[PDB]
Design a protein around this ligand. Structure first.
Ligand code: NA
Ligand code: NA
Ligand code: NA
Ligand code: NA
Lengths: 166, 166
DNA sequence: TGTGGATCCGAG
DNA sequence: GTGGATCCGAG
């Protein structure tokens, strides 16, 4: 089982306003999870412009400390540009896999953003009703759909994608 | 006064075989100096392919230590990619202006070799009789013409230029 | 055959 | 506030 993690934040420096994962078993996506989170800092305007999550939405939510345990249960954590989420999240009990690094080894000379790959690779996932891009669970599905494409194409195991990831 | 310095070396790591310089005063090029130099090391064939200066040509020439002192006594020093000449030469007694950096700043999206600039700017200068690109005294005239044009176009001051260079 | 330096990229 | 990849100048 590979668990894709995505996160929304107050800015590039961190503070968590949302977290989500989907799990990947037998090349299928299952077991969606997502939580709005009460951050440790103001939500930057430039951040708010992106994910559209307001102070009002998170003010009654638990802290990242409180919420993270729900995401335990996985040897492997997959994140697009995993280095970000790795930094801004608290220490996870798995090992990491970055779908950005992998897509660059897999398909050199292309464009390497979550949404760029998804279009380029002409992919189609059953997306969650009612969330736009750069939300939380949405991008997980995009990233997962992209993880599947990547495994199918290369046949890479978990532990191979971990090592490549570095 | 601005002194344009150029150098032909044994390679990218150093080892002078030619120094040369010209001075810019009121947009005119004056006081040419040039010396074939005996390098502290073999002229790699890679470098020699460029400047076409043979071992024979420099066998009975002075060391760079007997010859640099002719080039001291200026407040400013101009070289194209100053950070090369600066590195391969003895500590020079002034302030440095790099025309490569000024060009990148003045004209973005362009190519930035001493000869690319010259052609792009369609500059015309009187180059010493029977020398050649990578001939030393030859590129000093080219770079002086570049400096001159940069100065016409930006109205930058010697001090402004150094600051830019960094 | 190396340096370095800029200069874009990814993540929000 | 930044770390990872490239590309480009000088001989
Ligand atoms: Na993300
Ligand atoms: Na996102
Ligand atoms: Na030079
Ligand atoms: Na030269």
């Amino acid at each position: 089982m590979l668990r894709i993690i995505d996160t929304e934040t107050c800015g590039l420096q961190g503070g968590i306003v949302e977290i989500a994962s989907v799990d990947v078993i037998d090349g299928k996506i299952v077991n969606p999870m997502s939580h709005l989170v009460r951050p440790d800092r103001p939500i930057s305007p430039q951040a708010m412009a992106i994910h559209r999550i307001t102070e009002a939405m998170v003010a009654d939510k638990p802290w990242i400390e409180d919420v993270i345990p729900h995401y335990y249960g996985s040897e492997w954590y997959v994140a697009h540009n995993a280095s970000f989420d790795r930094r801004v999240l608290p220490e996870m009990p798995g090992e990491w896999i970055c779908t950005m690094k992998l897509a660059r080894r897999l398909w050199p000379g292309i464009k390497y953003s979550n949404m760029a790959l998804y279009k380029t690779r002409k992919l189609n996932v059953q997306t969650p009703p009612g969330l736009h891009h750069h939300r939380a669970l949405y991008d997980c599905y995009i990233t997962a759909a992209l993880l599947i494409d990547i495994m199918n194409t290369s046949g890479w195991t978990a532990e191979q994608m971990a090592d490549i990831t570095g």
